[PDB]
Amino acid sequence: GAMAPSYRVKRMDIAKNDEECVVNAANPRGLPGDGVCKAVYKKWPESFKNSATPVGTAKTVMCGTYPVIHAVGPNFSNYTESEGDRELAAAYREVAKEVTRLGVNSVAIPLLSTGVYSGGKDRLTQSLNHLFTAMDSTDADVVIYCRDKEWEKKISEAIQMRT
Ligand SMILES: [Cl-]
Ligand SMILES: [Cl-]
Ligand SMILES: [Cl-]
């Protein structure tokens, strides 16, 4: 575990993370995809061997000794708000299980279902609160990666509010 487990946020490409493992915002089919998934495919393409996994689940595949946790959030274009909310919460609970199993002291995480799976809605708070619910009982240092300037401020504020 980390000596004083923390949450931090950085605005940059998650493929340049300084953590002991990465969470991929994956598709269920283990395809290269777009956005975070494509950056992860270019950096760790070996990790996409047998990475296909259902919505609401996470599947880890090693790239050398570096763990890539493929977490499949729901596409809110297809799911109801109610069923999408349940799958998005579940995906993050499966990430917490994998992070614990791997024994890492740190993890780089994106906000699941906030990009092309958002169904055109702002889900910063929804996705971040499910991340916190899952990760608060882990002792890994969590570093959240985003790409928007206003989102960096809102994530930072939400971390600081809990102290
Ligand atoms: Cl960058
Ligand atoms: Cl997304
Ligand atoms: Cl963002």
Curated annotation (Swiss-Prot):
It is a peripheral membrane protein. ADP-D-ribose binds at residues 13, 27, 35, 115-117. It is found in: Host cytoplasmic vesicle membrane. Residues 4-163 form the Macro domain. Changing residue 13 to A: Partial loss of ADP-ribose 1'' phosphate phosphatase activity. Phosphorylated by host on serines and threonines. Interacts with mRNA-capping enzyme nsP1. Interacts (via C-terminus) with host G3BP1; this interaction inhibits the formation of host stress granules on viral mRNAs and the nsp3-G3BP1 complexes bind viral RNAs and probably orchestrate the assembly of viral replication complexes. Interacts (via C-terminus) with host G3BP2; this interaction inhibits the formation of host stress granules on viral mRNAs and the nsp3-G3BP2 complexes bind viral RNAs and probably orchestrate the assembly of viral replication complexes. Interacts (via C-terminus) with host NAP1L1. Seems to be essential for minus-strand RNAs and subgenomic 26S mRNAs synthesis. Displays mono-ADP-ribosylhydrolase activity. ADP-ribosylation is a post-translational modification that controls various processes of the host cell and the virus probably needs to revert it for optimal viral replication. Binds proteins of G3BP family and sequesters them into the viral RNA replication complexes thereby inhibiting the formation of host stress granules on viral mRNAs. In the N-terminus, the macro domain displays a mono-ADP-ribosylhydrolase activity. The central part called, the alphavirus unique domain (AUD) has a zinc-binding function. The C-terminus region, also called hypervariable domain (HVD), is mainly disordered and binds several host proteins. This intrinsically disordered domain contains 2 SH3 domain-binding sites and 2 FGDF motifs necessary and sufficient for the formation of nsP3/G3BP complexes. This is Non-structural protein 3. The chain holds residues 1334 to 1493 of 2474 of the full protein.
